[PDB]
Assembly symmetry: D6
Homo-oligomer: 112 residues x 12
């Protein structure tokens, strides 16, 4: 994960479960992006970014860069932290996104 | 899986769970196809088609050919990717279809 | 299973889970049959009848004979295939019925 | 189980799970019996009574005697079969009742 | 459990799971007690009190004393039996209460 | 019904009439071993609790054999011994099941 | 009730009155072995925590035997020893269960 | 269909026509061991209960082999022996599966 | 846990699962805090604070200090106990909060 | 509270104040074996992560014993050793639990 | 796609193009043991059933090795042997995975 | 972030920056055994798949050790060896975790 917040700037352990959903029946006049839901859930331990992600989650801070190499592979736009579980004997950060790219390279709802 | 997109053309690991449902009570004036839901879920690893399927899923790209040999057996029409889970220690691609053929050979809602 | 379709005629591996439900409170003016739901779910492998059952399921083809010996025991009327899951390392065919007979011999909503 | 139907007369393997529920808040003007739900679920194999219970279930036949010794202990009134699952490698018959007696001896909504 | 019914008087095996819930958002004009739900579930075998609790459950009989020592610790007011599961190879009696005391000693919605 | 149950001392009066049948046979028979000694038959009965409970529980600890064991639904079992009770699992030798309708009976290691 | 519990030193005062009963007997009795030594009786009690908790937890570590063990519901147990506590599983020898109504009692390996 | 089932004494009449197929082969073959002896084939059939139940249950205890074993869906099995029945798991040697459409058949350890 | 009630003052075993949720779509005119839900669930045994937390839960007593060191790390404002499960062979206290701080140090909806 | 935790070198400063208690005693005591050596006490603590995490994780690998171990809720433990941590399971010898109210304490294998 | 699959006799025609990849390496390598012999690679493929099913099932019983094994998504596998099929789990030696985009390939125990 | 990962030949370029940490220590240390040899440390990383996948999968089969292993969240690990990958479980010796805020680090079996 290379991650940078709108506010907190750059934030410094292998996530990750990528979930994407699209209804078979598209609402009349609805954009595919609005009908779809993209969510990637990252699991990792707890350290210096934990308070940074937890602040972003409560303040609705946008991720300025969200790039997952798996220079990378997954790149996500309009990233918003939507859920987090911190616990003990790990945390699980669930992100919501709009545009995405996987690298043949695929991309949808991307923005220049 | 022999697969080809409307847009991406031909896309290059053993799925697969075929689910089909039909309500016992058919709505007055409703076609059996509209009441039914056909879904096949394919599990496979992750490689050159992964970004291709993931782009199709976000762009609502129609599969032009969807043929599962199991020259084949399962052939599906109006194929639309409706869901996908990519994760680690695989992905799971869930397709929605209208017409279908299994090969005695059976076929319903097929189109020339 | 000795099975014959309305259309496909006779169709050629030990199912089976029989489920039947009846509400304690019967709606005013409602027939017991309409309040009840009879469902038998058969699990078996996949072969020459698989496409035949899968076609019946999509075309809403009525089973003309549905007799389960367990010359038999279970016999079912107005049989309609309502669900099917085909998968790998089997299929599961879920039938809906009205009249039934088990053989003391019991029978309800049967028709000559 | 000593059991006798309204219609089938006397019917000839250790059930049994007794479930009874009562809401803490009783509806204004509602009798405790109407708010409550008594259900006993009997599991047993499959034999001469199986078609008899299965006929009762579809025909809404009232049990004339329902006495479970565990000369007995559990005795139930207004017994109606509400659910049944027959299956293989057993059946499970779920009864609904009004009045009941367990034997100190307890009894509620009983009738002479 | 030292227990005495409103009606059955005194009733003669280590429960017990105490559950209490309170919504974070309190309805305007609502008392905390009415928003909350207190439930203690006792598991024990089956014997002379079994028919006594089962009668109380069907007759909505109030427990006059409900004291759980764990001279005791848990004491509960306005105790009403709300659920019970009797079964075999135990019963589970689920009580609902208003006032409570645990013994530092805590107490809420108690009454002299 | 449930079970008609008589005991080889003593006595038999558990209230009448009062399940999961398991039978195993190794695929390879030990050289010189009779199938009966190689096989294992156990029927597990579920029920609530009363007058038979202490009678079953005394039998289990005293290694008291049954003398009649028939659970009609008809099953009949020989050399029945209680091997486990969570408050009932019986172990048997000879066995007979007989269906209805038909009068077909299967039986093995039965004794004159 | 719960348990009336006295201890063989020391003492007995855990507040009165304060479960899953398991008993096992191997189908084949070791040659020359008494059933009591071959069998295993354990009753597992669930409860909250107070004045008896340290008393139970001290007994478990000190291998302190009980002297009265009766959990009335009536069960009575001899040579009761605490073998496991996740904050309670007792192991016993002799046992008696007695039902109500009736006055029927089963008992094995009881001692004068 | 279900199964056409004939038995090597006696007899064959379980009502016709009446599943999970498992086959295992260790990756490393024991030196001097034939694959057939190293492998294990078992097909587990689920079904309700009737005229074949006592016939299957008698066969299982008597170590009665089958002589025809074909479950058409076509599967055919040799040296079929019932090894387990929870009221059916068969163990086999030779096997053949044949698909439709096509006429393709796979077969191993089959016998003339 | 260093904890102090509004009323009970200071209250005297390693929780803890921190859950925080934020909807991707923020209601028009809604503050992020009102859309979000912060919940931390602490598991611990049962002792002198148990009645104190249980009283707070029923009386809707505000925690004046809620500081979890893991001088600390987690600090929570407007803490309200919303749920509790006390049981046996532990309790689980579920808190709801507004402002929070984890220590880089993150903080949201905090108040001087 | 959580835990007050001091360590036998070094040091003790994990921020204060910072669970599932398991204790087992075999029913049969090995001849000549002291109960303490036969028994096993382990308390499993769940918590998030901070300044104590590296301190706990260093202790676990260095086989560093604790010198104060008290988790107040009061539990006190001797010879405390960390045996497992999934990012905490401690193993102990002597133990004391003390309830409130009352001042009742149980204790075993405690040391002067 | 699925798999392109050729077999070392005979033959290869299972319809093209037709999963969970597991690889294990003990942390401590046996003295004098090559990693390949110490490791275990198995890929489990899920799919429906047709013309390849009898071909896979014949291969599994005949210990028929594959000669081409490539599942493109690209995976390529050597010494592929079917070890288990519930109606497919393959065991392999050499392996290659190659990603897209990039042209990066990892490979071990591959053979010229 | 994820992981910064360098390898001891060859090479290191899996795209940067790219989990469940388990550590076990037996309560009783084998006589003459160093804690490090008695303990077992494994961190399990979950992630999607790309350029590092073949690099991780080649390393696992070739018993290729890592030379930098740091997963920042900061964890640092020595003698890191891949032991299992379902398409990642690493085994390590020395370890360091360092929290933020604070600058507190725990470390064991680290090497100069």
């Amino acid at each position: 994960l290379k991650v940078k917040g709108k506010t907190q700037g750059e934030i410094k352990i292998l996530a990750f479960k990528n979930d994407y959903d699209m209804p078979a029946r598209l609402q009349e006049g609805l954009t595919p992006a609005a009908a779809a839901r993209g969510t990637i859930t990252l699991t990792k331990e707890m350290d210096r970014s934990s308070p940074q992600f937890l602040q972003a989650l409560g303040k609705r801070e946008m991720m300025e860069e969200f790039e997952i190499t798996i220079l990378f592979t997954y790149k996500f736009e309009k990233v918003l932290i939507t859920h987090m579980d911190q616990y003990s004997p790990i945390e699980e950060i669930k992100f919501t996104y709009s545009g995405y790219s996987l690298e043949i390279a695929g991309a949808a709802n991307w923005t220049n």
